[PDB]
Design a protein around this ligand. Structure first.
Ligand code: ANP
Ligand code: CL
Length: 331
């Protein structure tokens, strides 16, 4: 028993027919810029992988954001730079304006455009049913683009989505965990945040694809329409698979892992139980019912499936009646 393999149903051979220099981020040269052009103003935040500053381009007075990367691996650093460059100009993908060496830290520093973002705790307590569809379509444009350029995000969550609600502007940020989908390739299952890890990561299945991003988008949507943040609230990676299973049930969980000849961590024998699949109507109450509709549940239902192969792709998702009410773009 070794796991059965898997391919993406879409965009399977994008990077097989693109040049080597497209996807091979190892053999990539960084074209540096003048660091004296930028003047730091304010610390916005500290991560495990970087510090982040609000800043000002001194050459044209533009406001700007500077992600100074901590030293970890030149592999990971060039990878983020090369994916951002490849995706430059795509819809609602955040724009890399420059790359400079910070003289203090001696590490690369990524200069992005500025987004006048709103706190996500303030924002998900205020979105109307229309706003939720609007921005979900906007994230979908971004996901289908990056998938169509042969790149999975692997860290889709509300913190990584900057929304300027004033101008209805949206931008998908932090491509630090993004990677190139190559068919047959086994990836590291230690990606994304806990609440938004799909079951493939949780059962240690390494041959995942673009559709991982769709599971996470489904988690984001569940919390927005049901007003439960986070929707699957697990204490650790083992309990996370149990919370999903209290909702989606264990019979379909076992079908999923038998289909790919995956064996569960023995520790599950003593915590997993047997759980009926629940109907989405149970999560509906007086305080979130204005956000729920038949078409919202239908869409959500097609995103939160165990089988990564049976999930809606980004393009199929954009075709759902859930988005019919949303205003498009003939002019
Ligand atoms: N283009 C941008 N516009 C505005 N704010 C941004 C932008 N990019 C990053 N930020 C800020 O940086 C945060 C996200 O940092 P990210 O780029 O996710 O770095 P990271 O290495 O993942 N760091 P951490 O998440 O903090 O461990 C946001 O909450 C903002 O405060
Ligand atoms: Cl990795």
């Amino acid at each position: 028993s070794g796991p059965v393999p898997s391919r993406a149903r879409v965009y399977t051979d994008v990077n097989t027919h693109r040049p080597r220099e497209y996807w091979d981020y190892e053999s990539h040269v960084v074209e540096w810029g003048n660091q004296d052009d930028y003047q730091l103003v304010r610390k916005l935040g500290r991560g495990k992988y970087s510090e982040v500053f609000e800043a000002i381009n001194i050459t044209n007075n533009e406001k700007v954001v500077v992600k100074i990367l901590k030293p970890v691996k030149k592999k990971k650093i060039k990878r983020e730079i090369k994916i951002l460059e490849n995706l430059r100009g795509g819809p609602n993908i955040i724009t890399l304006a420059d790359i400079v060496k910070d003289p203090v830290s001696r590490t690369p520093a990524l200069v992005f455009e500025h987004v006048n973002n709103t706190d996500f705790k303030q924002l998900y307590q205020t979105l109307t049913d229309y706003d939720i569809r609007f921005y979900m379509y906007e994230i979908l444009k971004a996901l289908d683009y990056c998938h169509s350029m042969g790149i999975m995000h692997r860290d889709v969550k509300p913190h990584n989505v900057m929304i300027d609600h004033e101008h209805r502007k949206l931008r998908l940020i932090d491509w630090g965990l993004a990677e190139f989908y190559h068919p047959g390739q086994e990836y590291n299952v230690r990606v994304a945040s806990r609440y938004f890890k799909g079951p493939e990561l949780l059962v240690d299945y390494q041959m995942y694809d673009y559709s991982l991003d769709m599971w996470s988008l489904g988690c984001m949507l569940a919390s927005m329409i049901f007003r439960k943040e986070p929707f699957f609230h697990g204490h650790d990676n083992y309990d996370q698979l149990v919370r999903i299973a209290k909702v989606l049930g264990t019979e379909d969980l076992y079908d999923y892992i038998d289909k790919y000849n995956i064996e569960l961590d023995p520790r599950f024998n003593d915590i997993l139980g047997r759980h009926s699949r629940k109907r989405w109507e149970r999560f509906v109450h007086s305080e979130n019912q204005h956000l729920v509709s038949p078409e919202a549940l239908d869409f959500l239902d097609k995103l939160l499936r165990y089988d990564h192969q049976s999930r809606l792709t980004a393009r199929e998702a954009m075709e759902h009646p859930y988005f019919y009410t949303v205003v498009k773009d003939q002019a």
